Each structure stands twice: as C-alpha cells, then as structure tokens.
Amino acid sequence: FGPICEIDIVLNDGETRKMAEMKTEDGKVEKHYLFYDGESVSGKVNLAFKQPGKRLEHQGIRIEFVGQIELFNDKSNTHEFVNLVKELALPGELTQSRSYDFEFMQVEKPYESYIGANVRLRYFLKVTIVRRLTDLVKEYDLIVHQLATYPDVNNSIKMEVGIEDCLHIEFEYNKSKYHLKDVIVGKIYFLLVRIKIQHMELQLIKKEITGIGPSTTTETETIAKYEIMDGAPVKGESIPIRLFLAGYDPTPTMRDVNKKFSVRYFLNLVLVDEEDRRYFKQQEIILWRKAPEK
Amino acid sequence: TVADTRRLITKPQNLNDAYGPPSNFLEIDVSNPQTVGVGRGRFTTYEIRVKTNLPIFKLKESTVRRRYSDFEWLRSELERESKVVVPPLPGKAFLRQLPFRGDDGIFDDNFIEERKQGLEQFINKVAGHPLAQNERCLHMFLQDEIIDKSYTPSK
C-alpha cells in the first residue's frame, strides 16, 4: 500500500530565501531555511493524495509554528517557548489532493537555534491531520539566528597572574566580546621566569551548562589548541597573539536561554614546562553573531 | 588594505634581561654509587650533586650522599604536607635482598645503574616542581649533609 497521504510544506519565499547549516551528531550537516526574530512565516501545505479510489476521514487539519528546547533527548523534558496555530480544515474527508494557505504574522523568535550535547533548540512547522487513532504529522525545520550590533562597552582584558616567585606574566586580549569571524589580537608579557617553559598555547573552550540550580551538567569541548610560543622566554619578553576565530566556526554565547541552558566560551592560556607540568588561566569571552550591513 | 597585520604594541626588552643568563637554571645529577659497611649492614649510597641559580636554594652548588631510603623519606614527606602528586621511585626491590640468587642481589650493576637513572629521573621532577621547592624536606634532602628525620615540616 504505502501512505494514503503525504504532507509537504512550501514557503512563499522558497526561491529567494537564504538557507543556513547545522552541525548535528556524527559530523552530519543539515540545511534548513533561515529566519529572524520578527519575520512572518507563510506558505502552502500541499497534501499529495496517493491512493486513488480511497478516502481519508479526519477530525481536522492544522499547522503549528513551534519553537522549543529539548533536554537530554528526553521527550518528557521538551519545553515549548513559542506555539502558534492555524486551523486549515474542519473535520471531514479528503478524496483528492489539496493545498492550504497559511501565514503567521510577524513571528517572535527570541532565541537562536542550537544543537548541543544535552540541549537542542529548534524551530519548525508541524502539520497535523487528526485521525481517529493515529495522527498524520509532518515536521518542517527552520534555523533562526539572533543578531546583535557592535557593543556599547568593550574593554580589553588585561591581567597579571602567576605562581609566586616562579612565574609572573601579564596577558592582554584586545576585547571581551568578539564576533564569530573576529580575531583575538593579544600579547603575553613575561615579568619573572624561574621555570623552564617548553611551549605556550591559547585554547578556545566551549562549555554547555544544562539544568536548574543544584541540577547542573556542564559539557566541555576544547574547540581550538593554538600554539603561540615555542621555547623558553626570559623576563621582559613579549609574545604576540593573532588567533582568527573564523577557522573554528563556533556558536554565539547564549546565557540562561529560557532559564534552561547556557553556552559560554573561554580563552584558556596554557604554558607547559620541560617535565610536562601545565600552568593555565581561563578567561570567559562573549561571542556574538554580527549583523552584516544588509 | 589586503592583510590584517594587527598586533598590540610591545615594550622593548631591557638588554640585561635579553642577553644575561636565564633565571631557571637547575640540574641535579645522581652519580657515583658506593657500598657503605660490611656484611649484613651493607647498603649503597649515591652522590646528589646540585647546580642552580634559583634564590630559594640556599647554596648555588652542593654535593651530598644519599641512600635509597632517604629518597623514600623525601617522597613520603612530600606526600603528606605538599599536596603535590609526587612521581614514582624506581622501586624497592625486596626479593633482591634474599640470599643465593643468580645475581649479586642488591649490588647487581644492571640493577644499580637502572635504579640510579630512576632516582635522577625522580629528583629532577620533584626539584623542578614549584610547590615542592617551598617545602623544607626538599632542601634538607639536597643540601644538608645529613637528614634530620625528627623535624617539624615547615613552608
């Protein structure tokens, strides 16, 4: 036999509209349409009727725009932060194929789409033909990006750290907030060096924190290891840093999204001595998706 | 503009710092294994020769004689006060003390050589460690001619 009916969604601007990509599990890359907070979603629900002769008895057809946050792949732990409905058909029949117009006016999309370890945030259109025992359901995924402008305050990070009477350094990164294709311009200045340093590197670390209160799970992933020194410095030596963030394709910093999860980035500076002992200093940086002019 | 050539501006390095010798010099040699005693008393000692320029070490050069038990005492003291994960010693080989083996037992040369390297391995790790250099036991071991086991651990 097969299926009696097949649901297909086609957006009104399905030719001109820009798409975007998403890294899922095992290195797979999906491509869905791109949307922005405030935009209207509109199109056609097209029902292909497959079994000619037969009839489809339903108790109503609808389409939903859905934005939600899924935790630990646990269906019971899904949380919808946006839900809009358009009833397309009353209870009735379908003998042949038919389409239905829909439009969701100026749709609020407060958060950016994200697929992590213990968290997913996704938007989609869900068409539902309601039947007596089992609904025909079709999901249709969308990407939402959250944009921002150049920040009001952006101070350089500058810090004197060390181990007492062994190593003193002063590191400086040129900003606290870097856009996704920005550049870490910085320097490491050595004030006291009484250990034997083999090499030094800057690392980019992405923490994904899930849960509420004492319920807290942090998933850490070391996105970049970037060597910046090779060999022993002496005091008074300055080492330059120029690390292009474009190379590693990170997400924006996302802080307490719906009071459910965070995603934060850190600059972990690490020096390594001759006996492989490892001295470090972590510093949070905010990432943000820059709005291109237009 | 065709290339992003941005760097932060640097302070010129003072020429004394730039050329003058580095301040992280520390080498410890374990050498010259020697029997001390006769008969059942016998044990091997090694020369622990230090060269440094770190202010914390109270002699720039030192030479002392140490026993493998002393190395165990150092490691044992560091495991209590220091809170440093201390590296391993090359190992107490008890069954080498047993009589009528097919080798010279505790005074076998392939043994003493291999142990000697392990102690050099151990002491250079321990002595290079920052948190370890504070503790009184390390200086006591490297630079006092005899260790005073009845001591109160400081620093």
């Binding site: 190593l167 002992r277 490892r278 200093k281 | -």
Partner: peptide
C-alpha cells in the same frame, strides 16, 4: 596524569 596548576592573580 599531567599536573594542572591554576595561575593566581597578584
């Protein structure tokens, strides 16, 4: 396995 020491502010 490999020692990791946090650098303190002065």
């Amino acid at each position: 396995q490999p020692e990791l020491y946090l650098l303190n502010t002065m």
